[PDB]
Amino acid sequence: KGMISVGPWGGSGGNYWSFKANHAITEIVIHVKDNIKSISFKDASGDISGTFGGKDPRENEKGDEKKIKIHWPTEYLKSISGSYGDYNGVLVIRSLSFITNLTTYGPFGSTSGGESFSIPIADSVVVGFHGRAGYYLDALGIFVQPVPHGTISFGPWGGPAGDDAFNFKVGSWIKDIIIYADAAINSIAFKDANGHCYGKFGGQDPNDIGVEKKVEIDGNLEHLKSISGTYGNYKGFEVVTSLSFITNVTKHGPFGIASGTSFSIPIEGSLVTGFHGKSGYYLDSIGIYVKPRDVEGSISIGPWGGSGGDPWSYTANEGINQIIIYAGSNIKSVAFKDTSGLDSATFGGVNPKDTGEKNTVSINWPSEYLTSISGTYGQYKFKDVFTTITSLSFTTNLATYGPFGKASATSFSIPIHNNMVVGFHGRAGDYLDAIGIFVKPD
């Protein structure tokens, strides 16, 4: 269920409305003359939304009807564009286009006397609409979810160059942003909630590195929702000149100096889970990956095992697909891949002289899906003595995998049903001290 809200664009009059389709959106009905008088929708199984707007009593204000058909299932709605501006003294949607994987329908309505809006988005499917309406359509936005196996992406914003591409996604959340900036963004780097570090992207100029600044996000109160900033000329290059980091709680920034063309993205319900773009001497361009926060919550069970190691966690963006376990007489490390390409770091295995042997559990998701873990923990001795997970099995709705490592005296399991494992968490250092799961009903 969870979706990201984009926009809306237009004026602030009218009453809030939303429509979340129960099946793919296959028709958009609008009433148009100079502006958008009204809008409604229809889904693949004939369900309709109400009509939003169109409340002008004046008859010469009804507007002409246009039906946009989406040739489902080979064509699907992915985005919109259009324009807002004044109409009879009200800030209102004036024109609209509907962007599909195959073509664009529109523009509909007047394309003058406006201010246009568009969305630098990828891997999205529009699963609903929202906006403001009164007599007319004051404002319009969309509800998006990722495409199967994908991740919603916005941007990148900035210049066109940068010899070094970068691109990563996290399985926890962004906790630290380290920026060197002055008037421009010289470089950027990020830390996981697990402490894993991404990049330095940029900062290759020996005679110009900029001034450091750090943003530290407390996961108990705050989470990265979005970014904004500015890009334009720096010493002859087109690069990012300022950035702000937007959370549910506040705006951190701006860093660098605001010059050139400013950018932002009006999203709600989003957790930034990564970044992509290009860099070189400086940060040429940057974009975000974003995931819907759920309405659901996840239950956390465990962890079981020793009480050393640094805390770590991994939640699938989609479905956990693959588990890599290094084992010998205990468990050295654990790693996860998911159906959307989200690959965890390796948790454990920090000691090159004790790495164990690689094992792979491959899960055909979603027909097969993880269901719980069981195993043992206890003493393990290399040079020193440790308390770690020593043996470990994984259960799915279809089968059991392992055991891996060696059984020891203290065993654990979870008599659990009607659930699926959506993620893992625990503690690791040289080995896998402790491990637990995140679950959801089904």
Ligand X SMILES: OC[C@H]1O[C@H](Oc2c[nH]c3ccc(Br)c(Cl)c23)[C@@H](O)[C@@H](O)[C@@H]1O
* Sign of the alpha-carbon dihedral angle for 227, 230, 233, 238: positive
- Out of ligand X, a copy of itself, none, what residue 430 binds, judged by CB under 5 to 8 A for its kind, is ligand X
CB 27 within 8 Å of CB 162 = no
Q: In this complex, which beta carbon is closest to ligand X, that of residue 148 or of residue 195? A: 195
d(CA 334, CA 211): 38
- Out of a copy of itself, ligand X, none, what residue 161 binds, judged by CB under 5 to 8 A for its kind, is ligand X
Give the closest residue to 241 by CA, choosing from 262, 253, 258. 258
Q: Does 180 bind ligand X (CB under 6 A)?
A: no
- Give the 3-state secondary structure of residue 134: coil
Give the closest residue to 158 by CA, choosing from 260, 254, 274. 260
Give the closest residue to 121 by CA, choosing from 95, 92, 141, 94. 141
Distances (CA, A) of 295 to 3, 124, 273, 438: 9, 19, 17, 15
Q: Does 429 bind ligand X (CB under 6 A)?
A: yes
Stretch 293-332 residues interacting with a copy of itself (CB under 8 A): 296-304
CB 300 within 8 Å of CB 425 = yes
Number of chain residues interacting with ligand X (CB under 6 A): 30
Q: Point out which span in 43-51, 219-227, 291-299, 430-438 binds ligand X (CB under 6 A).
A: 430-438
Least distance (Å) between residue 91 CB and ligand X: 8
Name which position in 64, 65, 115, 163 contacts ligand X (CB under 6 A).
163
Stretch 37-76 residues interacting with a copy of itself (CB under 8 A): 40, 42, 45-52, 54-55, 59
Q: Give start and end residues of each alpha helix (H) in 169-222.
A: none
The 8-class DSSP code of residue 59 comes to: G
Give the closest residue to 290 by CA, choosing from 373, 341, 224. 224
Which two tokens mark 276?
């992509």
Q: Which residues of 322-340 are buried (b: 16+ CB within 10 A; e: fewer)?
A: ebbbbbbebbbbbbbbbbb
Q: Is 397 exposed, middle or buried (0-12, 13-18, 19+ CB in 10 A)?
A: middle
Name which position in 7, 10, 14, 375 contacts ligand X (CB under 6 A).
14
Distance of CA 333 to the CA centre of its chain: 27
Least distance (Å) between residue 14 CB and a copy of itself: 8
Q: Does 52 bind ligand X (CB under 6 A)?
A: no
Which two tokens mark 7?
């926009």
Which string of x and - marks every residue 119-158 that binds ligand X (by CB under 6 A)? --------------xxxx-x--------------------
Q: What angle do CA 224, 321, 197 make, to 5 degrees?
A: 40
Q: Does 88 bind ligand X (CB under 6 A)?
A: yes
Name which position in 52, 386, 394, 438 contacts ligand X (CB under 6 A).
386
d(CA 231, CA 263): 8
Stretch 245-284 residues interacting with ligand X (CB under 6 A): 279-282, 284
Q: Does 19 bind a copy of itself (CB under 8 A)?
A: yes
Stretch 288-317 residues interacting with ligand X (CB under 6 A): 308-310
Residue 366, preceding peptide bond in cis (omega within 30° of 0)? yes
Q: Does 133 bind a copy of itself (CB under 8 A)?
A: yes
Q: Point out which span in 76-84, 193-201, 291-299, 352-360 binds a copy of itself (CB under 8 A).
A: 291-299
Q: In this complex, which beta carbon is closest to a copy of itself, that of residue 384 or of residue 442? A: 442
Q: Does 200 bind a copy of itself (CB under 8 A)?
A: no
Which string of x and - marks every residue 213-252 that binds ligand X (by CB under 6 A)? ------------------------x-x-------------
Q: Does 442 bind a copy of itself (CB under 8 A)?
A: yes
d(CA 5, CA 143): 5
Q: Point out which span in 40-48, 159-167, 296-304, 391-399 binds ligand X (CB under 6 A).
A: 159-167
Q: Does 89 bind a copy of itself (CB under 8 A)?
A: no
Residues that bind ligand X (CB under 6 A): 13-14, 53, 88, 90, 133-136, 138, 161-163, 237, 239, 279-282, 284, 308-310, 384, 386, 428-431, 433
